Design an enzyme around this catalytic site. Structure first.
Site, PDB file in Angstrom:
ATOM      1  NE  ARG A 119      33.053  78.300  96.716  1.00  0.00           N
ATOM      2  CZ  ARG A 119      31.892  78.084  97.330  1.00  0.00           C
ATOM      3  NH1 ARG A 119      31.316  76.888  97.275  1.00  0.00           N
ATOM      4  NH2 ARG A 119      31.302  79.055  98.007  1.00  0.00           N
ATOM      5  CG  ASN A 120      36.890  79.380  98.753  1.00  0.00           C
ATOM      6  OD1 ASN A 120      37.401  79.260  97.636  1.00  0.00           O
ATOM      7  ND2 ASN A 120      35.763  80.039  98.933  1.00  0.00           N
ATOM      8  CG  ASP A 132      33.302  82.481  99.175  1.00  0.00           C
ATOM      9  OD1 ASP A 132      33.959  82.698  98.139  1.00  0.00           O
ATOM     10  OD2 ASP A 132      32.351  81.651  99.228  1.00  0.00           O
ATOM     11  CG  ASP A 182      38.511  82.797  97.225  1.00  0.00           C
ATOM     12  OD1 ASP A 182      38.311  84.041  97.195  1.00  0.00           O
ATOM     13  OD2 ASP A 182      38.194  82.032  96.297  1.00  0.00           O
TER      14      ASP A 182
HETATM   15  C1  LIG Z   1      40.105  82.916  92.906  1.00  0.00           C
HETATM   16  O1  LIG Z   1      41.465  83.026  93.342  1.00  0.00           O
HETATM   17  C2  LIG Z   1      41.791  82.136  94.411  1.00  0.00           C
HETATM   18  C3  LIG Z   1      42.638  80.964  93.857  1.00  0.00           C
HETATM   19  C4  LIG Z   1      43.151  80.066  95.009  1.00  0.00           C
HETATM   20  N1  LIG Z   1      43.859  80.914  96.000  1.00  0.00           N
HETATM   21  C5  LIG Z   1      45.026  80.443  96.608  1.00  0.00           C
HETATM   22  N2  LIG Z   1      45.478  80.962  97.761  1.00  0.00           N
HETATM   23  C6  LIG Z   1      46.629  80.571  98.306  1.00  0.00           C
HETATM   24  C7  LIG Z   1      47.396  79.606  97.655  1.00  0.00           C
HETATM   25  C8  LIG Z   1      46.914  79.092  96.440  1.00  0.00           C
HETATM   26  N3  LIG Z   1      47.656  78.130  95.771  1.00  0.00           N
HETATM   27  C9  LIG Z   1      47.212  77.076  94.966  1.00  0.00           C
HETATM   28  C10 LIG Z   1      45.980  77.072  94.300  1.00  0.00           C
HETATM   29  C11 LIG Z   1      45.659  75.969  93.493  1.00  0.00           C
HETATM   30  C12 LIG Z   1      46.617  74.928  93.354  1.00  0.00           C
HETATM   31  C13 LIG Z   1      47.843  75.036  94.011  1.00  0.00           C
HETATM   32  N4  LIG Z   1      48.075  76.074  94.795  1.00  0.00           N
HETATM   33  N5  LIG Z   1      46.085  74.000  92.534  1.00  0.00           N
HETATM   34  C14 LIG Z   1      44.898  74.369  92.151  1.00  0.00           C
HETATM   35  C15 LIG Z   1      43.992  73.574  91.227  1.00  0.00           C
HETATM   36  C16 LIG Z   1      44.673  72.357  90.592  1.00  0.00           C
HETATM   37  O2  LIG Z   1      42.891  73.129  92.016  1.00  0.00           O
HETATM   38  N6  LIG Z   1      44.579  75.577  92.723  1.00  0.00           N
HETATM   39  C17 LIG Z   1      43.291  76.279  92.559  1.00  0.00           C
HETATM   40  C18 LIG Z   1      42.514  76.479  93.873  1.00  0.00           C
HETATM   41  C19 LIG Z   1      43.385  77.490  91.643  1.00  0.00           C
HETATM   42  F1  LIG Z   1      43.998  77.125  90.451  1.00  0.00           F
HETATM   43  F2  LIG Z   1      42.110  77.967  91.376  1.00  0.00           F
HETATM   44  F3  LIG Z   1      44.145  78.491  92.231  1.00  0.00           F
HETATM   45  N7  LIG Z   1      45.769  79.557  95.944  1.00  0.00           N
HETATM   46  C20 LIG Z   1      43.101  82.038  96.593  1.00  0.00           C
HETATM   47  C21 LIG Z   1      42.556  82.942  95.484  1.00  0.00           C
HETATM   48  F4  LIG Z   1      43.666  83.529  94.882  1.00  0.00           F
END
Ligand SMILES: CO[C@H]1CCN(c2nccc(Nc3cc4c(cn3)nc([C@@H](C)O)n4[C@@H](C)C(F)(F)F)n2)C[C@H]1F
Length: 299
Positions: free
Chosen positions: A142-143, A138, A156
């Site tokens: 976006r990831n 994936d 992700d």
């Molecule tokens: C579908 O779950 C995903 C969500 C994103 N993930 C992730 N992995 C490691 C660190 C992390 N931190 C992280 C994620 C963040 C963020 C700050 N830190 N700000 C955003 C918004 C404003 O853009 N996001 C997104 C991608 C969301 F809200 F969707 F998470 N986020 C990996 C999976 F957990």
């Protein structure tokens, strides 16, 4: 046959962390901006908390398994899990959000140096996943998350496996569900195209069921206006039908690093090198005892 996975799964108490605001929401659940204040440690760690039926619980634990098993500067690791009525994943806060939204929003201040360095970092993270025998399945802009404009990480692991996003997938994956490190290289090529076009949608307006046919005939994503033939040729090689003919992540690291040494020879951007992006050497870039997850090691 395969090495034992000795990764530690850290179980965190609900009382050790606080939710500040929602960062994102979807069918999966919701992601919060938070602070993790462990034991009697005198540290506040900025975190992203993903809060989640027994089958969706198995999906979050499978992602947690993979995410707890990685350790590299260009890949996001699981800090821990909280077992409440709803299972929560505690991850590092990536304060600039995803790279896709970042390139769309900061386009007028994104120079060739940043774009090429991001390509190197993503190739480094992917090469690490390959070393760990992990197929991402994936990879997309976006990831890829932004810790700072100069530091990105792949995340992700919801589709990651050992040993659907049609428009980012290799042809073998669409037609036969075959996934390898070489199918991740195809996705890497699409991700680079997303960066070089400042977040354009691949094959925009073309329905997913038409993509397999379009690829079989030999149609590929167009040359972005900023790309020299040197950069585009790399993207094109990631989209060869023969998986073994595609570059390896280790070669992608080398190629993009050579280009990152003389960035204006490889990407042509109006006003390049007169462009400014936030750096940890700026006023109010970053509050007492706050420590980044990358500097907070073991319990
Ligand atoms: C579908 O779950 C995903 C969500 C994103 N993930 C992730 N992995 C490691 C660190 C992390 N931190 C992280 C994620 C963040 C963020 C700050 N830190 N700000 C955003 C918004 C404003 O853009 N996001 C997104 C991608 C969301 F809200 F969707 F998470 N986020 C990996 C999976 F957990």
């Amino acid at each position: 046959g395969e090495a034992p996975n000795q990764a530690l799964l850290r179980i965190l108490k609900e009382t050790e962390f606080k939710k500040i605001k929602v960062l994102g929401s979807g069918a999966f659940g919701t992601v919060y901006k938070g602070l993790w204040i462990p034991e009697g440690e005198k540290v506040k760690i900025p975190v992203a908390i993903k809060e989640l039926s027994p089958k969706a619980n198995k999906e979050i634990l499978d992602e947690a398994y993979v995410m707890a098993s990685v350790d590299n500067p260009h890949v996001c690791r699981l800090l821990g899990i909280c077992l409440t009525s709803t299972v929560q994943l505690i991850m590092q806060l990536m304060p600039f959000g995803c790279l896709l939204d970042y390139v769309r929003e900061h386009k007028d201040n994104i120079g060739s140096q940043y774009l090429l360095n991001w390509c190197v970092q993503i190739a480094k993270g992917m090469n690490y996943l390959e070393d760990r025998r992990l197929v991402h399945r994936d990879l997309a802009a976006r990831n890829v998350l932004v810790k700072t404009p100069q530091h990105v990480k792949i995340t992700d692991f919801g589709r990651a496996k050992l040993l659907v996003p049609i428009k980012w997938m290799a042809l073998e994956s669409i037609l036969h569900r075959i996934y390898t490190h070489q199918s991740d290289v195809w996705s890497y090529g699409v991700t680079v195209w997303e960066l070089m076009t400042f977040g354009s949608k691949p094959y925009d307006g073309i329905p997913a069921s038409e993509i397999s046919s379009i690829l079989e005939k030999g149609e590929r994503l167009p040359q972005p206006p900023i790309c020299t033939i040197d950069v585009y040729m790399i993207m094109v090689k990631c989209w060869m039908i023969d998986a073994d003919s595609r570059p390896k992540f280790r070669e992608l690291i080398i190629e993009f690093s050579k280009m990152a040494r003389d960035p204006q020879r490889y990407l042509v951007i109006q006003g390049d090198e007169r462009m400014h992006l936030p750096s940890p050497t700026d006023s109010n870039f970053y509050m007492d005892d706050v420590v980044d997850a990358d500097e907070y090691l073991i319990p």
